[PDB]
């Protein structure tokens, strides 16, 4: 505790849900600084110590808490999901905004890049594709990973390397849970 | 582990010196809320949600106390082993595609934060901007470090440049992540 | 193994009564109750125990103080007849799903 | 809040004393019953989790009915010595404090 001697602890509870509540896994992690020393795992069903640092806690924890923790899987995990998640986060549907833009200059023959910006949507599941005259392009195509905005919305940018021509129609097709019908944006020279 | 959904109901972060703490609820990697430990109030990131669910702030205070307790016990046991300083990384990108004169938001995502103490600020052309700024709590990472995001509302102009300034004990000199309407 | 200062005290309206408690159980949580015919036990003030203090169900007219792990005191800065009862101090683990240990009690009368 | 049906009860040694309790905060997950003998403070007798629906320990058995938010403590084979005031408490799935009830006074006639 002399001068720049920083100390912190972390408690990280986890309710892993698979297929609604058909399967739940409850994990409770006990971290000292950045080191996980103790851990409860519903799969294992017991407070096993992770590292040396957590040697002194196992026995005591399984004594005093084992029963109280196993229960949280129902009173905390299943409960919060069915009683609070269902009406809020699991019901959140924000529709994507979709726009196409060219990376360089508009002229009559350039190896440019079309960018399809898909933004402010929720939840994560989404599908974005490029078409050139009705045929899907997959070769000079790339999309960023899912970008989490931190405000409960995502965005993904999808690039298509191409060479514009006359009467050539490019389309960005987006399918998302919030859209009863897919969105299609068009771009021409 | 894996799943279709992940809930973290009661993340506790307590550090010293300073008795600095944080209590949050996450779902699918997003902040449901954080309990304001001074106001003793649950602060929901999405107001609408608070209309349908709730959480007694006392639960956070009770557990933040246990954080004060377990820490110390562990600071004594670890033979007083201090935390090792990591170096933060920042990325800047707009919420929506940039259009001259149209209201947007600039986002600064700072990752690999450890310990969870940091100052993140915005510079319009090289001058600190303090209005229209919002910051998230500290999100947990798989490796136990943290990320956090800051936001700046702004109007895109040809005569404007931006920088996200991050200050951390793991940097020798404040990091400036530059950004400007391309 | 919980102790309370006045095991019985009689004061007058307006007086500044101060019941105090002590617990060796080395518990983090401490509570102050009051038993009354028709209400059973009612939490008044409690602590996560450092220099912590939180309002219970009926905190009005009261103020608590937890100067140390084992000391939790209840204070009435202006006694009232409505405060004539039996005060029960208690201690337990951080939590609420944990067993609570009570003291003997304390009868108080203001007049 | 917590409620205890039997405002007061008297039974002759050997029978079965049934106590009742109810609450209406589905978030309640832990319910401990305290026993208080005249002269001293209350003390924890038997506690149950919302997970199960029954808990036994001697003559004492808690009957927890998740829905309808009912709950009851059965003392089979009564006995003078079990005669003080019993308290039904409860706490939520958050870690908040326990909330007791009116409390039933039991008298066991030898």
């Amino acid at each position: 505790g002399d001068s720049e001697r920083h100390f912190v602890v972390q408690f990280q509870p986890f309710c892993y849900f698979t297929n609604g509540t058909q399967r739940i896994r409850y994990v409770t992690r006990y971290i000292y600084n950045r080191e996980e020393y103790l851990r409860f795992d519903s799969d294992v069903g017991e407070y096993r110590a992770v590292t040396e640092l957590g040697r002194p806690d196992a026995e005591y924890y399984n004594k005093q808490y084992l029963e109280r923790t196993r229960a949280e899987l129902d009173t905390v995990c299943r409960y919060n999901y069915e009683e609070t998640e269902v009406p809020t986060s699991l019901r959140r549907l924000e529709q994507p905004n979709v726009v196409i833009s060219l990376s360089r200059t508009e002229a009559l023959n350039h190896h440019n890049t079309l960018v399809c910006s898909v933004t402010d949507f929720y939840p994560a599941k989404i599908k974005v594709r490029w078409f050139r005259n009705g045929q899907e392009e997959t070769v000079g195509v790339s999309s960023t990973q899912l970008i989490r905005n931190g405000d409960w919305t995502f965005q993904v940018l999808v690039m298509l390397e191409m060479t514009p021509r006359r009467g050539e129609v490019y389309t960005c097709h987006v399918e998302h849970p919030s859209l009863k019908s897919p969105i299609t944006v068009e771009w021409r020279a | 582990i894996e799943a279709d959904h992940v809930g973290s109901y009661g993340i506790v972060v307590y550090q010293s010196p300073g008795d600095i703490g944080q209590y949050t609820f996450e779902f699918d990697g997003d902040e449901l809320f954080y309990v304001d430990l001074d106001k003793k109030e649950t602060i929901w990131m999405l107001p609408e949600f608070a209309q349908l669910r709730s959480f007694d702030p006392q639960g956070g205070l009770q557990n933040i106390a246990t954080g004060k307790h377990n820490l110390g016990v562990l600071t004594k046991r670890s033979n007083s082993t201090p935390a090792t300083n990591e170096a933060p990384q920042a990325t800047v990108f707009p919420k929506s595609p940039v259009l001259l004169g149209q209201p947007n938001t600039l986002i600064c995502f700072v990752d690999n934060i450890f310990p969870p103490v940091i100052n993140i600020t915005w510079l319009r052309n090289s001058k600190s901007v303090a209005d229209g700024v919002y910051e998230t709590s500290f999100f947990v990472n798989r490796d136990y470090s943290f990320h956090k995001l800051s936001y700046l509302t702004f109007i895109p102009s040809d005569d404007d440049i931006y920088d996200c300034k991050v200050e951390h004990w793991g940097l020798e000199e404040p990091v400036l992540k530059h950004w400007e309407p391309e | 193994a919980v102790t309370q200062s006045p095991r019985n005290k009689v004061a007058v309206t307006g007086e500044k009564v101060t019941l105090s408690c002590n617990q060796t159980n080395n518990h983090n949580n401490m509570y102050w109750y009051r038993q009354d015919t028709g209400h059973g036990l009612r939490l008044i003030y409690y602590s996560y125990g450092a220099g912590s203090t939180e309002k219970g169900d009926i905190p009005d007219g009261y103020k608590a103080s937890r100067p140390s792990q084992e000391n939790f005191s209840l204070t009435l800065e202006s006694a009232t007849p409505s405060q004539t009862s039996v005060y029960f101090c208690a201690s337990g683990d951080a939590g609420g799903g944990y067993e609570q240990y009570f003291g003997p009690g304390t009868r108080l009368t203001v007049l | 809040q917590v409620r205890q049906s039997p405002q007061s009860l008297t039974v002759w040694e050997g029978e079965t004393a049934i106590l009742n309790c109810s609450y209406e905060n589905s978030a309640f997950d832990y319910f401990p019953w305290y026993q208080q003998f005249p002269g001293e403070g209350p003390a924890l007798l038997i506690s149950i989790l919302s997970v199960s629906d029954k808990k036994e320990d001697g003559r004492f058995t808690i009957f927890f009915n998740k829905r309808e938010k009912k709950l009851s403590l059965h003392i089979a084979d009564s006995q003078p010595g079990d005669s003080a005031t019993y308290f039904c408490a409860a706490s939520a799935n958050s870690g908040t404090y326990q909330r007791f009830g009116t409390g039933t006074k039991l008298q066991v006639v030898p």
Binding site: Y61, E72, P87 | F55, D56, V73 | - | -
Partner: peptide
Amino acid sequence: SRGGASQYRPSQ
């Protein structure tokens, strides 16, 4: 509508 939370367990 009242959410629960995983309790952080004390040591020693």
